[PDB]
C-alpha cells in the first residue's frame, strides 16, 4: 500500500527530499545512488534520525544508477544530479518504468526537451517537474486569490531566480563546507564541482524554473495558455572575478578565468492569450533574497520583496481599497487569502512539521502516484521551462534575437485543465 | 541680463514650467503661444499671481507660433506641446534662433530624431531634453552615491513609466477637470483630447525618458557609454476598455474601441561598456505610482517602491552593511547621500520654495543660457530617448526582433563627459 522511492543523487538537495520521505510512513526509502560516499552517510544519517532502515547504496562510479534501476520493488525515484547528468538519470528512470521526481534547471541542450516527453509519452511513466516555489505561502495565497478573481484578468508578470550564489559557487573543497574559498570544478565541495562550469562555458537564462513556475500556474501555461517565443539580453560579467579577488586575492589561478555567464540575464516571453513575462537571472551579485516577484492584472497587483514571507510585499486591489492610490502591506492578504492546502497542513510543514514549501512539493508527488493520477507540473511543463536556458542562449549568441519556444504538447495545452493546487490535499 | 523666455504649448505642463520662470527675477516671461484661450488664461494668473506682467499672446490657430518665433528679443522658448507638435515646435524654433527648452515623450517616427540633431548642428542653436525624473531628490542621493564608487560598478538598471494614467486619457472635456468622464479625442480636455489617441493606432514603448534617463545620468550614456539595441513585447490590451465600461457604461460609443497599445510593454536594451536596461510603459491599469527603479552594480543594489520619498526604497551594501544579506531602507541613504545640489538649495524647491525636481530641471536651463554652457541633458539625448518609441513599435510588429539603436552623436558619445548634476548649482 505505500510507495517505494529511491534516489539517483544525494547531494545536499537530494537530501532534502530524503528527509521529506524519511518522515513519511506512506513511503519506503529502498535505495540510494551517489558515487560520493560522504554525500550517502549524511543521507543515511537523515534515515537513523527518523527511525527508518538504511537504503542500500549504488556508490560504484556514475553508472551505478542503472543497476539500482532494475530493482523492480522500486515504483518512483527522485532525480537530484548535476544540471549536465538530468536527462541521462531521468530517461533511463522512465526506461525502466520508474515515475520521476525531477530536480529543476535548465536543459543542456533543446534535444533533451523533446526526448524527456518522447521517452514518456512512449514509456507511459510520467515525470514531474519539482518546483517548490509553486507551493511557497505566499504564492500559493497570491494564486487563490487569481482564481478568486481578485487580479481580474492578468497582461503580466514577472519573476527570476535573484540569490547569491558566490559562495555555492565557491568553497575550498572540504565535505560540508560552503563560502569558504575560490575552487571550483574537480577539488571543490556539492554545487562548486559541476554548477560554476556552466558560468565558465555558458551565457544565458541558467535557472528559470522558480520565477516562471509560479506564473506558469497563474497564467494557465500548458493548460490553456502557452508560452510562444522569447528574447534573452545579457549584461557582462563581473561579479564572479571580483569575488575571487575579494576572497582567495589576485595571486589565485582563478582569477585569470573569465567568465561567460553574465551578472544578469532578462527574457522577455510571451503569452497565447496576450500576458507576458519577463525572468531575471541573477546569482554573482551581492544582494538580499528577493525573487522579484510581480503579478498584474486588470483589478490587482502584487510585487515582492523578501524570500515569502506574508508582509515581505506590497499589493493594491482598486475596488477593493477605496481607489485610494496607495500600496498595502500584503501581510494581511496573504494571511486572509492563505491557500487551503496549507491551512489545513500547515503543521505538517512549518511548526510541529518540516520543510515548508517542499513538504508541499514532495506530498503531491506521493499522493499523485499512491492515487493513480497525473502530476500538476508534468513532462510537457519540465520540457518548456527546460527550453527556455537553451533557447536564451541561442538569443544571446544573435544578439537577443527572438527565439520560438516549442509546443511539447502537439496541442494538447489547449484543451488541458489547471490542476495544481485546486485542492487542499495535494 | 535676465533671460527672455517665451512658451510654445501652455497647456498643464507647459502651465509648470510658467510658474517656474514666473518666480525667477532673473527671467522676464515675454510671451506666450497656444490655440486654446482657458490654457492661456490660467498662464496669465500664475503671472498676475507672482508679479510679473502680462504676456503677448499668440492664440491664432495652432501655426501662430511661427509669428512669436519673429520676436528677436526671445532667447529661449520651453516646448510643451502634443507628442505630433514637438518635431515641428522645437525645429522652428532652433531656425528661429531660440535655444529649446523640449518637454519628454517619445518621437513619432525615427526621421524626427535626426532632424532634431541635424537641426541644432546647423543652427548651432542647443536644446534641453526636459527630463524632470533626473534631478528627483531619491535619485539625484543615487548618482551621488554611483559616483562615489558605493555601488561598484554598475551591470543592470530597470526602471519605466508606470503611472495610471486613466483618469487623464478621459476626461468630461469640460475645462480645468480629469478622471471625470469616458470621452476622449476633439471633444475632451487636456491630454484626452491628444494622447489617447496615440493609444489607439499605436504599440511601443510611448514615453521612456522618466524611466531610462536616471539610467542614462548614472550609467555615462552618450557621454563615454551608450545605447546599442533593444527589443520590445507588448501584452495584451485590456484595462482602457475596461476602465471605460466600469466608468461610463457598456452603452458608450467608446466601449467600441480596440486599443492597439498593449497595457505592459517592455524594452530591454544593451549598453555599449556591457550594462544592460529593461524599461516598462505601464499607464492603462490601476496600480499605485512607481517608476520601479533598480540600480544594481558589483557593491551596491538600490530597489525602490514609491514616488521618491527617502524611506520608499530598499538599499544593500555588502562591504558597508556587513554582510547581513538582508535589505536596509533607503531612508539613511538617501538623506545621507543628499546631491549637494539638493542640499543646497532645497529651500526654492520645497518648503519656503516651490516647484520640487521641476525648480531643479528649470532651474539648469537657465544656468545653462546665461552662462553660455552646454546642457547635460542635450539635443543628441533627446533624439536617442526618443528613438525608443518607433523603434519599439518596429520591434512589436516585427514579434519582439531586435532594433539596432542609432548614433546620433556619431562617435562624440566616446569621449564626450558627463556635465549633469556635477556642481551644486546647475
Ligand atoms: N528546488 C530547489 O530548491 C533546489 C535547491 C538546490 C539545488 N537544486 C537542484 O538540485 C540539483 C542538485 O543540486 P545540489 O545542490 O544537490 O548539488 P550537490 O553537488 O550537492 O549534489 C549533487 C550530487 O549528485 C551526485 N552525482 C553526480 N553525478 C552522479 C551520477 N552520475 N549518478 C548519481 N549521482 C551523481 C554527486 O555525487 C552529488 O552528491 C540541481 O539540479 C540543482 O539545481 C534545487
Ligand atoms: N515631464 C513631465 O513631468 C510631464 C508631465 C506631464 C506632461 N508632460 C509632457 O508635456 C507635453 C504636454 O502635456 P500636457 O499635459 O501639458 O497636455 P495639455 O493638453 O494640457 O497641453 C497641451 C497644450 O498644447 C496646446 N497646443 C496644441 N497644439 C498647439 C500648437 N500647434 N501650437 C501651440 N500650442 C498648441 C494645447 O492647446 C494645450 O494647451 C507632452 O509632451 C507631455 O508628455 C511632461
Given at each position: 500500500?505505500?510507495?517505494?522511492?529511491?534516489?539517483?543523487?544525494?547531494?545536499?538537495?537530494?537530501?532534502?527530499?530524503?528527509?521529506?520521505?524519511?518522515?513519511?510512513?506512506?513511503?519506503?526509502?529502498?535505495?540510494?545512488?551517489?558515487?560520493?560516499?560522504?554525500?550517502?552517510?549524511?543521507?543515511?544519517?537523515?534515515?537513523?534520525?527518523?527511525?527508518?532502515?538504511?537504503?542500500?547504496?549504488?556508490?560504484?562510479?556514475?553508472?551505478?544508477?542503472?543497476?539500482?534501476?532494475?530493482?523492480?520493488?522500486?515504483?518512483?525515484?527522485?532525480?537530484?544530479?548535476?544540471?549536465?547528468?538530468?536527462?541521462?538519470?531521468?530517461?533511463?528512470?522512465?526506461?525502466?518504468?520508474?515515475?520521476?521526481?525531477?530536480?529543476?534547471?535548465?536543459?543542456?541542450?533543446?534535444?533533451?526537451?523533446?526526448?524527456?516527453?518522447?521517452?514518456?509519452?512512449?514509456?507511459?511513466?510520467?515525470?514531474?517537474?519539482?518546483?517548490?516555489?509553486?507551493?511557497?505561502?505566499?504564492?500559493?495565497?497570491?494564486?487563490?486569490?487569481?482564481?478568486?478573481?481578485?487580479?481580474?484578468?492578468?497582461?503580466?508578470?514577472?519573476?527570476?531566480?535573484?540569490?547569491?550564489?558566490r559562495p555555492v559557487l565557491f568553497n575550498s573543497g572540504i565535505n560540508g563546507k560552503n563560502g569558504d574559498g575560490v575552487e571550483f570544478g574537480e577539488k571543490a565541495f556539492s554545487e562548486a564541482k559541476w554548477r560554476t562550469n556552466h558560468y565558465k562555458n555558458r551565457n544565458g537564462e541558467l535557472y528559470p524554473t522558480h520565477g516562471v513556475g509560479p506564473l506558469h500556474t497563474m497564467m494557465d501555461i500548458?493548460?490553456?495558455?502557452?508560452?510562444?517565443?522569447?528574447?534573452?539580453?545579457?549584461?557582462?560579467?563581473?561579479?564572479?572575478?571580483?569575488?575571487?579577488?575579494?576572497?582567495?586575492?589576485?595571486?589565485?589561478?582563478?582569477?585569470?578565468?573569465?567568465?561567460?555567464?553574465?551578472?544578469?540575464?532578462?527574457?522577455?516571453?510571451?503569452?497565447?492569450?496576450?500576458?507576458?513575462?519577463?525572468?531575471?537571472?541573477?546569482?554573482?551579485?551581492?544582494?538580499?533574497?528577493?525573487?522579484?516577484?510581480?503579478?498584474?492584472?486588470?483589478?490587482?497587483?502584487?510585487?515582492?520583496?523578501?524570500?515569502?514571507?506574508?508582509?515581505?510585499?506590497?499589493?493594491?486591489?482598486?475596488?477593493?481599497?477605496?481607489?485610494?492610490?496607495?500600496?498595502?502591506?500584503?501581510?494581511?492578504?496573504?494571511?486572509?487569502?492563505?491557500?487551503?492546502?496549507?491551512?489545513?497542513?500547515?503543521?505538517?510543514?512549518?511548526?510541529?512539521?518540516?520543510?515548508?514549501?517542499?513538504?508541499?512539493?514532495?506530498?503531491?508527488?506521493?499522493?499523485?502516484?499512491?492515487?493513480?493520477?497525473?502530476?500538476?507540473?508534468?513532462?510537457y511543463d519540465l520540457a518548456t521551462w527546460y527550453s527556455i536556458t537553451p533557447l536564451s542562449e541561442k538569443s544571446i549568441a544573435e544578439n537577443g534575437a527572438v527565439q520560438e519556444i516549442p509546443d511539447f504538447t502537439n496541442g494538447k495545452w489547449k484543451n488541458a485543465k489547471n490542476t495544481f493546487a485546486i485542492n487542499d490535499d495535494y
Amino acid at each position: 500500500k505505500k510507495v517505494r522511492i529511491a534516489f539517483i543523487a544525494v547531494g545536499l538537495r537530494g537530501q532534502t527530499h530524503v528527509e521529506n520521505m524519511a518522515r513519511r510512513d506512506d513511503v519506503e526509502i529502498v535505495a540510494f545512488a551517489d558515487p560520493d560516499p560522504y554525500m550517502v552517510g549524511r543521507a543515511q544519517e537523515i534515515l537513523k534520525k527518523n527511525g527508518k532502515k538504511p537504503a542500500k547504496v549504488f556508490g560504484n562510479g556514475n553508472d551505478d544508477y542503472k543497476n539500482m534501476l532494475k530493482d523492480k520493488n522500486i515504483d518512483a525515484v527522485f532525480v537530484s544530479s548535476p544540471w549536465e547528468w538530468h536527462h541521462e538519470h531521468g530517461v533511463a528512470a522512465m526506461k525502466a518504468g520508474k515515475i520521476v521526481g525531477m530536480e529543476v534547471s535548465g536543459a543542456i541542450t533543446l534535444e533533451e526537451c523533446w526526448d524527456y516527453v518522447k521517452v514518456s509519452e512512449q514509456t507511459g511513466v510520467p515525470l514531474m517537474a519539482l518546483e517548490n516555489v509553486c507551493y511557497r505561502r505566499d504564492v500559493m495565497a497570491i494564486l487563490n486569490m487569481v482564481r478568486k478573481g481578485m487580479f481580474g484578468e492578468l497582461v503580466h508578470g514577472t519573476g527570476g531566480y535573484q540569490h547569491d550564489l558566490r559562495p555555492v559557487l565557491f568553497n575550498s573543497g572540504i565535505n560540508g563546507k560552503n563560502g569558504d574559498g575560490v575552487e571550483f570544478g574537480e577539488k571543490a565541495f556539492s554545487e562548486a564541482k559541476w554548477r560554476t562550469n556552466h558560468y565558465k562555458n555558458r551565457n544565458g537564462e541558467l535557472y528559470p524554473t522558480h520565477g516562471v513556475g509560479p506564473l506558469h500556474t497563474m497564467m494557465d501555461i500548458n493548460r490553456g495558455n502557452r508560452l510562444l517565443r522569447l528574447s534573452s539580453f545579457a549584461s557582462k560579467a563581473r561579479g564572479l572575478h571580483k569575488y575571487i579577488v575579494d576572497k582567495g586575492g589576485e595571486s589565485h589561478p582563478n582569477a585569470k578565468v573569465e567568465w561567460k555567464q553574465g551578472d544578469i540575464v532578462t527574457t522577455q516571453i510571451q503569452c497565447h492569450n496576450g500576458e507576458t513575462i519577463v525572468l531575471t537571472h541573477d546569482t554573482s551579485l551581492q544582494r538580499p533574497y528577493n525573487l522579484g516577484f510581480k503579478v498584474q492584472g486588470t483589478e490587482g497587483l502584487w510585487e515582492d520583496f523578501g524570500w515569502g514571507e506574508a508582509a515581505q510585499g506590497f499589493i493594491y486591489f482598486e475596488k477593493i481599497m477605496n481607489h485610494s492610490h496607495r500600496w498595502d502591506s500584503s501581510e494581511k492578504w496573504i494571511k486572509e487569502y492563505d491557500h487551503p492546502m496549507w491551512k489545513k497542513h500547515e503543521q505538517k510543514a512549518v511548526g510541529a512539521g518540516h520543510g515548508g514549501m517542499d513538504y508541499f512539493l514532495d506530498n503531491t508527488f506521493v499522493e499523485c502516484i499512491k492515487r493513480n493520477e497525473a502530476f500538476p507540473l508534468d513532462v510537457y511543463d519540465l520540457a518548456t521551462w527546460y527550453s527556455i536556458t537553451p533557447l536564451s542562449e541561442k538569443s544571446i549568441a544573435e544578439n537577443g534575437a527572438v527565439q520560438e519556444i516549442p509546443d511539447f504538447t502537439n496541442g494538447k495545452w489547449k484543451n488541458a485543465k489547471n490542476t495544481f493546487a485546486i485542492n487542499d490535499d495535494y
